[PDB]
A paper describes a structure:
Since the CP-binding motif of the CARMIL proteins is sufficient for the interaction with CP, peptides derived from this motif were used for the crystallographic studies; mouse CARMIL (residues 985–1005; referred to as CA21), human [name] (485–507; CD23), and human CKIP-1 (148–70; CK23) (we collectively refer to these synthetic peptides derived from CARMIL proteins as CARMIL peptides). In addition to their extensive interactions through the CP-binding motif, CD23 and CK23 further associate with the CP “N-stalk” via the C-terminal flanking residues of the motif. In the CP/CD23 complex, CD Phe505 contacts the hydrophobic pocket formed by the CP “N-stalk” residues [CP (β) Ile29, Cys36, and Leu40] and the peptide residues (CD Leu501 and Pro502). The C-terminus of CD23 extends into the region between the CP-L and CP-S domains. Thus, the residues immediately C-terminal to CD23 (i.e., CD Gly508∼) are expected to form additional contacts with the domain boundary residues to stabilize the CP/[name] complex. Furthermore, the C-terminal flanking residues of CD23, which greatly contribute to the CP inhibition, cannot reach the nearest surface of the actin filament. We applied this method to the CP/CD23 complex and the CP structure extracted from the complex, and focused on the first lowest modes. Furthermore, we found that the CARMIL peptides alter this intrinsic mode, both in the direction of the rotational axis and the amplitude of the motion. These effects are observed almost exclusively in the twisting motion about the β-subunit axis, yet not about the α-subunit axis, suggesting that the CARMIL peptide suppresses the twisting movement between the CP-L and CP-S domains.
Author numbering:
A (entry chain C): 485 to 507
B (entry chain B): 3 to 244
C (entry chain A): 7 to 276
The structure:
Amino acid sequence: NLLHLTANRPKMPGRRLPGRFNG
Amino acid sequence: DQQLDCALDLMRRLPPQQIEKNLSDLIDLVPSLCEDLLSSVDQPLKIARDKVVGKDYLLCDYNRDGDSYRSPWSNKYDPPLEDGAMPSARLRKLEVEANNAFDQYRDLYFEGGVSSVYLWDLDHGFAGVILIKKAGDGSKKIKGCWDSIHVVEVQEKSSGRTAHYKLTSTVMLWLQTNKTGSGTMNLGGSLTRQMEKDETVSDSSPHIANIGRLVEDMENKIRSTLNEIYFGKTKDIVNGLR
Amino acid sequence: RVSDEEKVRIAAKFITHAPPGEFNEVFNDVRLLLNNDNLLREGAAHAFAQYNMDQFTPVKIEGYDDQVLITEHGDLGNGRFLDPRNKISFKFDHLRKEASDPQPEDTESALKQWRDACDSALRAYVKDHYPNGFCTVYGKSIDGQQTIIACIESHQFQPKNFWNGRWRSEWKFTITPPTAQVAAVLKIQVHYYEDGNVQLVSHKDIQDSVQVSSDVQTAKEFIKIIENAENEYQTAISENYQTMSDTTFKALRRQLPVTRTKIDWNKILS
Ligand SMILES: [Ba+2]
């Protein structure tokens, strides 16, 4: 029940994950 | 389901002295949340060297693509990438201008340190991150570091005469010392604030000025809050324990 | 790409690293992230116990005044802990943080009066110096050497105001007449989390060596050493705070540019 401001910042989709995480 | 909410709650509670390891551990605990976690969990800023122009720039999730980071100076990824996300020509021009502007802002307020600005396109406007990193000189055997992460979303209108701005700013402040009287003391962490405003977009009030004013107002406010929380509230809590 | 074994190792780690007064929230978070109550039960039960002992969790025993600390020194095996002041053992549920089944217990008839004298002196010191402090004093022979181990806990939990704090101190006097070697460690953790996550983590190691005589007089002397060192630590922490604020924080960023006004953004841009 804490407010998470950083969860609703604008995103950039299409970013590849770091290699060690695959995608 | 509630997983992201719990992951973010965890980051608010685990010691920020282990902030980098905490995130790495969380992504291992819930691997399918990796993108969302990299996007929502702030980390200390890292300084890299742009070997093309010879200027320092800052690394975070916002200028990353795969394992490479984009420099705001040379507009290139390091290590090189075939197909890294790049701003449009119009946004890159705004980005160069912002970088120059926030470099003067940085000199004026911080008198040192490193800044970086990264913009990207949205369907109806654009977003940016304004990054500032300043290390203290180590006087009186105190290590100090300040990180600013200002993320702005700008929604542009068909008329081009007004825009909606939403700023979400985190500042991280780290202090550490080891002395005979106190032993080891590490006072560290971050605060995040948000605000939102419609502004006129004009030649007298262009996007960079609108964003600059909001960033300046926010960071001045957070500097004073940090002062209150770090040196007022935590100290009072310590003295309340004994 | 991450195995269950690795996930529960991480779950156990996070549980042990929960800030003072926030064990329940962290546990709830981790439980929902693992989403495997069996894995959590098997691979993370050591972590509940390790948390409580590391944190010197005070616990009320039905029938006895004041509380006792859960510590590594009280751990009797089989879910039981020692209360050395009331001379009892009890079952302790690490998850509910509840004591039960108190039973009379024997310890060390040799170190008996010394432990009691030190306990008596320490309890008065703790009630005088801490708002809601608790202490536990153990007397054991370690590697053949008679040792008094004094543990002190004091916490303030205010989650409605988004903060919690805890002091722990542990003092070991190894009796080598006519002296005693003193080793101690003092620790503080404070967490503020209204719209953020700021923590102080602090610890100080103490080495000293003092004269020993009779049980009551030595107890007085031990408490003076504890008092002097804990006062000096708390004083030095407040001095460090002043220095961090007037020196380091001020050098990291100005309040305003030298013009004593905020920026003219139009003049920046041209
Ligand atoms: Ba998603």
